[PDB]
């Protein structure tokens, strides 16, 4: 994601005085994706005994 952040300021008027100027400055922010996992494992005799009940 990005940001703009403008800038600038004013002064009093004059015929031959220097002209002020404006500018800006952008930035970026980042985030990270995290992955997880989980599994299972079943035996034969265990399955039979579990199904017995």
């Amino acid at each position: 994601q990005g940001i703009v952040e403008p800038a600038g300021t004013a002064v009093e008027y004059g015929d031959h005085t220097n002209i002020p100027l404006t500018s800006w400055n952008a930035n970026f922010e980042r985030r990270t994706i995290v992955r997880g996992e989980l599994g299972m494992m079943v035996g034969t005799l265990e399955e039979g005994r579990a199904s017995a009940i």
């Binding site: 005799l45 039979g48 005994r49 017995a52």
Partner: protein, 53 residues
């Protein structure tokens, strides 16, 4: 005379191609198993079980 035979004279037919192999392979027996004849066999239970009543 008789020039040279180029190849070394020898018996033409090898020992193989003259052998016939019996169709069967004998096996070792080990001691006899006579519990079934004396008592018999009863198939009553099921696998993944624990006890017989």
């Amino acid at each position: 005379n008789f020039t040279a035979p180029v190849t070394t004279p020898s018996i033409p037919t090898p020992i193989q191609f003259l052998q016939t192999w019996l169709p069967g392979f004998v096996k070792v027996m080990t001691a006899a198993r006579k519990i079934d004849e004396i008592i018999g066999i009863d198939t009553v239970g099921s696998w993944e079980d624990q006890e017989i009543v």
